[PDB]
Design a protein around this ligand. Sequence first.
Ligand SMILES: Nc1ncnc2c1ncn2[C@@H]1O[C@H](COP(=O)(O)OP(=O)(O)OP(=O)(O)O)[C@@H](O)[C@H]1O
Ligand SMILES: Nc1ncnc2c1ncn2[C@@H]1O[C@H](COP(=O)(O)OP(=O)(O)OP(=O)(O)O)[C@@H](O)[C@H]1O
Ligand SMILES: Nc1ncnc2c1ncn2[C@@H]1O[C@H](COP(=O)(O)OP(=O)(O)OP(=O)(O)O)[C@@H](O)[C@H]1O
Ligand SMILES: Nc1ncnc2c1ncn2[C@@H]1O[C@H](COP(=O)(O)OP(=O)(O)OP(=O)(O)O)[C@@H](O)[C@H]1O
Ligand SMILES: Nc1ncnc2c1ncn2[C@@H]1O[C@H](COP(=O)(O)OP(=O)(O)OP(=O)(O)O)[C@@H](O)[C@H]1O
Lengths: 379, 578, 367
Amino acid sequence: REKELERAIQVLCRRRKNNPLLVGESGVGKTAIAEGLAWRIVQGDVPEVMADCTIYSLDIGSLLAGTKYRGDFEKRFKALLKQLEQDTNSILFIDEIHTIIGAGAASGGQVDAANLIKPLLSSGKIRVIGSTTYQEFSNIFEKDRALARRFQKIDITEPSIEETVQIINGLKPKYEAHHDVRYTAKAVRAAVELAVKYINDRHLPDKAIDVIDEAGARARLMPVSKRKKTVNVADIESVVARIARIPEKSVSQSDRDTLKNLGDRLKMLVFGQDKAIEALTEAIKMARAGLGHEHKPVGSFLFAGPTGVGKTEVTVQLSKALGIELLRFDMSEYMERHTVSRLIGAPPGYVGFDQGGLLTDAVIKHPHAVLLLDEIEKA
Amino acid sequence: MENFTTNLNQLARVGGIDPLIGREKELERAIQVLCRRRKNNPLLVGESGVGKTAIAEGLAWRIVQGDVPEVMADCTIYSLDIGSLLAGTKYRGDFEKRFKALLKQLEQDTNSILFIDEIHTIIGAGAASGGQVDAANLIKPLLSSGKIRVIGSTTYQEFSNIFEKDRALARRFQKIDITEPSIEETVQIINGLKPKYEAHHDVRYTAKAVRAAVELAVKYINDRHLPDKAIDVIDEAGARARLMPVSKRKKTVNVADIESVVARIARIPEKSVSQSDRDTLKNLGDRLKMLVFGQDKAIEALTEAIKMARAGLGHEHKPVGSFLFAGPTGVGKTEVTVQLSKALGIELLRFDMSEYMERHTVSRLIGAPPGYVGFDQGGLLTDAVIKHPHAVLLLDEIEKAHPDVFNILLQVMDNGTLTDNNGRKADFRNVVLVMTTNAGVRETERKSIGLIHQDNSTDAMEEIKKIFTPEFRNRLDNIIWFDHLSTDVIHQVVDKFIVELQVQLDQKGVSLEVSQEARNWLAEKGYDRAMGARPMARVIQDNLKKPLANELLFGSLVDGGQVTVALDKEKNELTYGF
Amino acid sequence: AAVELAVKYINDRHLPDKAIDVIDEAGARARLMPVSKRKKTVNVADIESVVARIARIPEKSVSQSDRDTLKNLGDRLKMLVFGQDKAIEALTEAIKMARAGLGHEHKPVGSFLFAGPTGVGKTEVTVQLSKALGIELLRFDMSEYMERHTVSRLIGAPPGYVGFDQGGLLTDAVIKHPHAVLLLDEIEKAHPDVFNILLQVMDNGTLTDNNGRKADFRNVVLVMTTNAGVRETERKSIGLIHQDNSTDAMEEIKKIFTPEFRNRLDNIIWFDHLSTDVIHQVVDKFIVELQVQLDQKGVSLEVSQEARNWLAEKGYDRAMGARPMARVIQDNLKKPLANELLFGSLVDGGQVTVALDKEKNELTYGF
Ligand SMILES: Nc1ncnc2c1ncn2[C@@H]1O[C@H](COP(=O)(O)OP(=O)(O)OP(=O)(O)O)[C@@H](O)[C@H]1O
Ligand SMILES: Nc1ncnc2c1ncn2[C@@H]1O[C@H](COP(=O)(O)OP(=O)(O)OP(=O)(O)O)[C@@H](O)[C@H]1O
Ligand SMILES: Nc1ncnc2c1ncn2[C@@H]1O[C@H](COP(=O)(O)OP(=O)(O)OP(=O)(O)O)[C@@H](O)[C@H]1O
Ligand SMILES: Nc1ncnc2c1ncn2[C@@H]1O[C@H](COP(=O)(O)OP(=O)(O)OP(=O)(O)O)[C@@H](O)[C@H]1O
Ligand SMILES: Nc1ncnc2c1ncn2[C@@H]1O[C@H](COP(=O)(O)OP(=O)(O)OP(=O)(O)O)[C@@H](O)[C@H]1O
């Protein structure tokens, strides 16, 4: 994070409005950027002007505690700004800065943490570092434009894969000290890559750390006979597949047989129509071996023929045999050009907005499942 | 006035107030309002950072400088600090006592002026659950009598939503609209402010530097107003330049420095081309032509649009490029765009426009209006572009969306802006807009009747013209019609797919080699011009992946080695090994 | 005159306070007017000046440079939008009438429906008008108002709902800049329920948002640009004679907008296609813009007149207006210049020349 810290220090040296606002997605490490700037200050690995200044992390609860008797909060805050003004070598850090947009009385929503710092930030006597997410920044913060213009927004993007690997290698000492385990560098690279591949609803510099911490916590629970061991690609892969629902390594366990005798086991329940079972089993076996499509479903099959010859039967038996939740969607309920609103949800502002989609929520809840669309020609 | 106000004339005498430049009309109006008999209370309103507080403080500054008509002299101005005044008023009656004491001091002075910055803040001081005597009411009688003179300052939104909601207090103040300066006026303002920033940063600004800063802040920074973002760029460049002398890269502030600072603030690329970024574009067409075979004119168009954008001579307020890749299935329309996003290391914004089949789905793109359930969410398109101002926007199968949704892209392609339900303008000047379709293909896959077979080459263009409105097609940068894949293209494609399979294998510690006759046989088996390059990957799948997956999942190839594929001549089958 | 002006120009305050404020401020001004010891009686002109200062409206400025601005406004615009003279004339005459006092009593300065084929200076002349007049341009891309309930965005959300404190976009934009140019781009794309707002905006010059504020349109030049019937204008009719589809597009205009809406439009100016000389002028304008872009990089440029004729003949397409000319200028100059400028001879130095060869129909270049 050389460029982000460099731009933050450039902003902090401005004559007026020297208030960097670190805004990025959730889990990118803006709080980490601020705390690491402090940690660099204590180590002297900072530009000359940025030496000899101490960063204070301001907590709203501790300040807003007990402040009845109108005036108590205003007095507390004015005293805080006073003590901060006399330093010229102190930087105030507010972790969730979108939350200082109100502390005033409910009687008249008025002078609060916002309307009390505007003259101070505009006059450039004190310096504040902020941090917020995009969702809060664009909904709560930049509504007091006079407050938003006093902060210089700094985009904190999520690091790359190898940058994340270097971050994990820098953070490895503390996690190893906490869990009393060791992580191999190859296991770290595998953790970052698998977090990129499978953990889709969290951002990069955090989900890899999550995988590391969970692998360490679990490896501290394996030693039921004191089997402390270093975390390799295998255990971390299993921890990732806990969210991905399918381990790529573990197939060599008591599951290679299930794919081995899947076709014969299904032919024990669906007689005739052998090539359909062949195709389904071969697709599942390819996806399990790792020759699958990196951006496509395990399979996309069209089953045709006269009715009642086992088109749905083979699918339900497959879902049973693989222990996989069958997701059935009858395309007889979708004979209109406007029913897809129940598949994906209604646009914002409409009656069914907060209800969500059927197909999307089903797939999100069951990442590993079978999708069945009966009578696709009916839809 | 002891510990609740700040004597602005004292602060101006110690040089703590920046010099007021221009603003002669507004200052004259403020003086005229101040010299009224009753209700002589000017209210400065305007957008954020246009100079309201600046004008109010420059009034006292000029009073100290003597550049005032001989009626406002000796009138020392006090700025009110509401927090300091409300700090210790813990007990009832105390706030009213100190406020009345301040008002008595001001009234008996008969000469001072109270400048209440953020004057929208005094509509609440009371605590006894109602419409108590609080400062708003405590000053209402005096303004109507003109015994004291008060100057306010509040933004347009604050004034319109909070201040003027109290009609009785509002009618006691005279509104003075502080409009944002022009380019020349803000140039003069920066020229007048130059000594302070130059002494602060120990740098010198060239005149060309100031002019370029103002022009670039006008062009790129579109969320702030003039006299606040130009000096923002200037102060930022000064702070950046002052961090160089520690590395002894000390100089004056040249235009290139201002451009770098602006590119940083607006999060856009300006002059990185001076570095190893010219080579990035130089071999860009080559780097794509080895990932997407055939369809070369598309790579030419994309590369040339990006080159015109990075060189500087692109469009002024239009997207970097707005193309309509039309062609049959599986010819690389989505793939070339994905590889373009990958090559530039720039974020890809993917929008499968088949989920927008209904006219009312536009609320997903630009948000729901005020008063409706999804208001706090905002549009997907606009928020995506605001987060990533430099990106590639890909609209897959745009022909599948409801034809009314293209009117959204109308203004995106023409003016490069798009406003969501909060009034935010998504900036599309650094977005490579690509829309893919197979619109006119079905008409070209037509069998003519008669003795003479007729050329159907123009049917694709006819159908595209019949689908997209003329005012929409009129603003497309180019409509790159894609051709089918030929035999040699199929060879290159099966080679690409074999390389991808070889990487997938290397992931598992296995190696593969395929004979040349085996590659040609794979190319011959699954080649189909009507289906593009997907059936070739399908044939590679059912021919190599299945037997290889059986060898890998069971025994032989667990930690396997060099797998060799060879073609037979007696039967034309494939051989395998370990 | 003070009482009457405070009545009909100041509609946010009540009567026996705004007349008093006019009088008091005029007295204070005449008291500060002795910058040459000049104190006199307050006449009607001083009252009108104070009122125009308060209500934020243009005053009687015939003694100003504004007289000269309005004088050459038509000729100045005609040098930025070539052809389409009748629209520039209607705009300039409406603005002049509004300035001379012979405006409408309670109507916007003008409410014009700019229709016509594509690629012609329809939405462009409005921007150039806002630039020449130096007044703020309020641009509203009406293609985002396809949903019938987006009126809540124009005038705000009613009391009791989430978007209340945000207000309406159009009303707030007007209240901020009462003297402006309102560009409702692509007006035909909005849901028909949106035209009903412009109904009262055009007939009565006012608009009430959710907070009960009155948006005053009496100084706003309302301009709406449309493409109604453009699909018809580009269609070649069946028969030996190809017809003029202009009146067809007018009938489409009539079928889109209700009669009570078309009845209060000051004029429906049907823009016409661009001719060849107009295309030559357009090429010249684009070349000037490109030269400005290049001089921003320290690169000069000159093009032989024959090469400009070649570009015009290459790009001319009446059915598509002046937009394909930008694409042709791009394809023929911007790409070679870009390849020379990024990695080529043109780094940090220009003096590029262009000319047409007659045998090969190509262009020349070089340092
Ligand atoms: N640049 C970095 N270097 C080292 N470690 C890092 C970096 N970024 C993040 N981390 C670590 O990854 C985790 C996530 O980062 P961080 O906590 O700082 O962001 P955040 O405060 O959660 O942001 P937000 O408040 O928007 O959710 C942290 O535990 C942090 O230690
Ligand atoms: N090849 C088969 N093997 C085993 N059982 C079978 C076979 N064919 C049919 N059946 C029986 O027929 C019943 C219904 O079959 P199924 O639900 O799959 O209909 P289908 O093939 O999907 O055709 P459709 O739904 O269009 O009428 C099953 O309960 C099953 O017992
Ligand atoms: N008339 C002017 N001449 C020179 N410089 C100016 C003028 N106005 C403003 N500035 C500069 O622009 C900066 C911000 O403008 P200004 O302080 O006047 O508005 P503001 O009071 O901060 O508005 P708000 O509080 O609503 O954001 C000031 O710090 C000042 O240095
Ligand atoms: N010209 C090509 N050269 C090499 N490989 C290719 C080409 N086109 C496609 N492919 C491959 O075939 C697959 C499909 O490509 P792509 O999706 O970009 O085609 P498309 O034009 O978008 O088809 P559609 O009309 O359905 O949108 C990709 O995996 C891609 O790698
Ligand atoms: N009569 C003209 N003279 C010179 N230049 C012109 C003329 N018309 C258009 N142009 C140029 O061509 C471009 C398009 O012009 P404009 O946007 O005004 O047409 P339009 O009517 O708004 O198109 P549409 O009907 O699709 O909305 C502009 O950049 C403009 O500079």
